[PDB]
């Protein structure tokens, strides 16, 4: 399967990324993560990471949009199919009454 | 001082910064910052930060052992300094008597 080696490895990777999830945890019910995130952070890799925060918020906002539009779109032809049939529904009198307004 | 532009994006970044911090301390008190952080980080980046974790607990054993050390020769010097005036400072009778116990 795997070699006695890459295994530790694994193992330690795994355990030092749990070890800095914790340790930034712990700083932020405490105040200090900010003087944390900048030791733990260049001042570039902190920029990058403010504009990828910006980028899921423009990749959303993209996202919802599109699909507030495929809804509206959707929901107008609903609307029409919907209206049809409910007009083929009606009764001659209710039909007629409404062709009189119309005329 | 500085341009119009500078300063919106100096500005920018800052709001950026805030916001991602906000983002991963709430994610926190939500139990997803596991999932957050994945999104935000590639794989190598979150070895990387595991890794400068491990580098921070070295360094910091490093530092606090070098000063244990150095703490220890201050301290036994001190005592031997001290030992030295004391041993000035001791009535005769002490002294001679130390001294037949030393014969």
């Known amino acids: ?3 006695p080696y890459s295994a530790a490895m694994a193992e330690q990777r795994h355990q030092e990324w749990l070890r800095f999830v914790d340790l ?17 952070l260049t001042p570039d890799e902190r920029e990058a990471l403010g504009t990828r ?4 918020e423009e990749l959303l906002r993209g996202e919802m ?7 509206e779109l959707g929901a107008g032809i609903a609307t029409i199919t919907r209206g049809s049939n409910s007009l083929k529904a009606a009764p001659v009198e209710l039909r007629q009454w409404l062709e009189e307004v119309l005329l």
């Open 1 to 3: 399967q795997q070699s």
């Open 24 to 40: 930034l945890k712990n700083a932020y019910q405490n105040d200090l993560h900010l003087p944390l995130l900048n030791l733990m």
């Open 65 to 71: 949009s599109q699909r507030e539009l495929k809804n």
């Open 53 to 56: 925060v910006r980028i899921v």
